[PDB]
Design a protein around this nucleic acid. Structure first.
Ligand SMILES: C[As](C)(=O)[O-]
Ligand SMILES: C[As](C)(=O)[O-]
Ligand SMILES: [K+]
Ligand SMILES: [K+]
Lengths: 66, 59
DNA sequence: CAGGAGCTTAGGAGGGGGAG
DNA sequence: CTCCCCCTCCTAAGCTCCTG
């Protein structure tokens, strides 16, 4: 019912990108831990990593384009 | 009823109207909404997104 | 309240796995 | 065919900005 589209703050994005640096496919336990730090549901941080891995794929293609 | 999925035949009518006008008024969006059997709300969001996909490919 | 824009999150199809 | 799980590709959609 509620889709506030989970707009991430910079502090939230900071912990996310930190975990994304160590691992791009974190297990559920690694996703719960960062979800508590950023005070967000775990399901939002899994959709984030899914989108974040696409961003990595998009940028390598965008680089080969330019 | 959470997300519209435009078929190939619907995108033909939508991209055709977009060629005539990037910003269509509600009357024109209704005519194409009935052709594609989708609510005019989806037609407005499509053009809002169709203009961003055009400004993206302009650079 | 409308109309726009930029940004990016989030439903959905659909490959693999499990099951009924 | 259905229901979950993983994953990606695709892009409709929600929020926040502007503008009258
Ligand atoms: C975009 As019109 C003038 O056909 O409503
Ligand atoms: C066990 As598998 C990587 O084929 O889902
Ligand atoms: K409104
Ligand atoms: K898999």
């Amino acid at each position: 019912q509620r889709r506030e589209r989970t707009t991430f703050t910079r502090s939230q994005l900071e912990e996310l990108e930190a975990l994304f640096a160590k691992t791009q496919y974190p297990d559920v336990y690694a996703r719960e831990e960062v979800a508590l730090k950023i005070n967000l549901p775990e399901s939002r941080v899994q959709v984030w990593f899914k989108n974040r891995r696409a961003k990595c794929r998009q940028q390598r293609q965008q680089q080969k384009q330019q």
